[PDB]
Scaffold this active site. Structure first.
Site, PDB file in Angstrom:
ATOM      1  N   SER A  26      -0.771  -1.154   0.245  1.00 40.88           N
ATOM      2  CA  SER A  26      -0.389   0.179   0.698  1.00 40.88           C
ATOM      3  C   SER A  26      -0.082   1.127  -0.472  1.00 40.88           C
ATOM      4  O   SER A  26       0.512   0.715  -1.480  1.00 40.88           O
ATOM      5  CB  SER A  26       0.846   0.068   1.614  1.00 40.88           C
ATOM      6  OG  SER A  26       0.522  -0.696   2.784  1.00 40.88           O
ATOM      7  N   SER A 104      -1.316  -7.545   0.421  1.00 39.71           N
ATOM      8  CA  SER A 104      -0.380  -6.852   1.305  1.00 39.71           C
ATOM      9  C   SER A 104      -1.130  -6.322   2.533  1.00 39.71           C
ATOM     10  O   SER A 104      -1.743  -7.119   3.266  1.00 39.71           O
ATOM     11  CB  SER A 104       0.268  -5.732   0.463  1.00 39.71           C
ATOM     12  OG  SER A 104       1.419  -5.232   1.140  1.00 39.71           O
ATOM     13  N   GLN A 105      -1.154  -4.998   2.813  1.00 42.56           N
ATOM     14  CA  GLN A 105      -1.921  -4.494   3.968  1.00 42.56           C
ATOM     15  C   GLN A 105      -3.416  -4.908   3.850  1.00 42.56           C
ATOM     16  O   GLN A 105      -4.077  -5.217   4.854  1.00 42.56           O
ATOM     17  CB  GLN A 105      -1.788  -2.938   4.030  1.00 42.56           C
ATOM     18  CG  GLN A 105      -2.497  -2.474   5.269  1.00 42.56           C
ATOM     19  CD  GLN A 105      -2.395  -0.982   5.560  1.00 42.56           C
ATOM     20  OE1 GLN A 105      -3.210  -0.476   6.351  1.00 42.56           O
ATOM     21  NE2 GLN A 105      -1.470  -0.221   4.952  1.00 42.56           N
ATOM     22  N   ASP A 159       9.441 -13.110  -0.850  1.00 46.08           N
ATOM     23  CA  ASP A 159       8.600 -12.004  -0.393  1.00 46.08           C
ATOM     24  C   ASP A 159       8.690 -12.072   1.134  1.00 46.08           C
ATOM     25  O   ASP A 159       8.015 -12.833   1.850  1.00 46.08           O
ATOM     26  CB  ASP A 159       7.121 -12.165  -0.826  1.00 46.08           C
ATOM     27  CG  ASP A 159       6.250 -10.971  -0.389  1.00 46.08           C
ATOM     28  OD1 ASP A 159       6.714 -10.069   0.318  1.00 46.08           O
ATOM     29  OD2 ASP A 159       5.084 -10.939  -0.776  1.00 46.08           O
ATOM     30  N   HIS A 172       7.441  -9.027  -3.715  1.00 45.07           N
ATOM     31  CA  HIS A 172       6.174  -8.543  -3.155  1.00 45.07           C
ATOM     32  C   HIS A 172       5.330  -7.888  -4.248  1.00 45.07           C
ATOM     33  O   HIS A 172       4.105  -7.775  -4.148  1.00 45.07           O
ATOM     34  CB  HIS A 172       6.421  -7.500  -2.019  1.00 45.07           C
ATOM     35  CG  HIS A 172       5.158  -7.261  -1.176  1.00 45.07           C
ATOM     36  ND1 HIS A 172       4.351  -8.184  -0.615  1.00 45.07           N
ATOM     37  CD2 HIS A 172       4.629  -6.016  -0.867  1.00 45.07           C
ATOM     38  CE1 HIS A 172       3.369  -7.552   0.015  1.00 45.07           C
ATOM     39  NE2 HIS A 172       3.552  -6.264  -0.147  1.00 45.07           N
TER      40      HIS A 172
END
Length: 197
Positions: A26, A104-105, A159, A172
């Site tokens: 993101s 992540s995303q 995380d 993260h």
């Protein structure tokens, strides 16, 4: 550097043997963000510049933080974009081995995409790496419809997104060493396992 469109730009008459499709996290820049370039340089070292095409997921994938909260952890438009790139690879270079990754995303996007992919194309993805996998708990560390031996998940202790939350904590943001060593190592190994050398 942070934008690579080797598949889109690539000449069909001189296809690379390996095509890597990667989705950033993101708010990250270009279409590779912070981790993609590190992976790319090491793949280039292994296969040569002409040997591998590096392709980030750009276009409709704007990587907005808010879309982590959507059902699949990213938007439908983003999934369509990444599906479109696997289908382009399959059409442009039918003999190339594919590899994929996301952070992540982008990891949720890679998982959603691969789950929806036509099996004949999915079967060409020899290895996928996921960093800070936001659907790690919900999917039990797997990508739906895709073999565990071709999957490698990097989920740091602490995380929180790996443990079913959408909180961004310091672990993260700590996948740099993984993208520099074990993630390209895994991908190279999985490509060589099927292509020899």
């Amino acid at each position: 550097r942070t934008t690579r469109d080797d598949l889109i730009n690539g000449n069909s008459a001189s296809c690379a043997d390996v095509i890597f499709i990667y989705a950033r996290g993101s708010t990250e820049t270009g279409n590779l963000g912070t981790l993609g370039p590190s992976i790319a340089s090491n793949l280039e070292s292994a296969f040569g510049k002409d040997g591998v095409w590096i392709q980030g997921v750009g276009g409709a994938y704007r990587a907005p933080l808010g879309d982590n909260a959507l059902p699949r952890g990213t938007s439908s438009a983003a999934i369509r974009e990444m599906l479109g790139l696997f289908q382009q690879a399959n059409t442009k270079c039918p003999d190339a081995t594919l590899i994929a990754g996301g952070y992540s995303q982008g990891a949720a996007l890679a998982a959603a995409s691969i789950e929806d992919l036509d099996s004949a194309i999915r079967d060409k993805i020899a290895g996928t790496v996921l960093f800070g996998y936001t659907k790690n708990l919900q999917n039990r560390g797997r990508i739906p419809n895709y073999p565990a031996d071709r999957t490698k998940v990097f989920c740091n202790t602490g995380d929180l997104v790996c443990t079913g939350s959408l909180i961004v904590a310091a672990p993260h943001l700590a996948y740099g060493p993984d993208a520099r060593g074990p993630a390209p190592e895994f991908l190279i190994e999985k490509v060589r396992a099927v292509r020899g050398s």
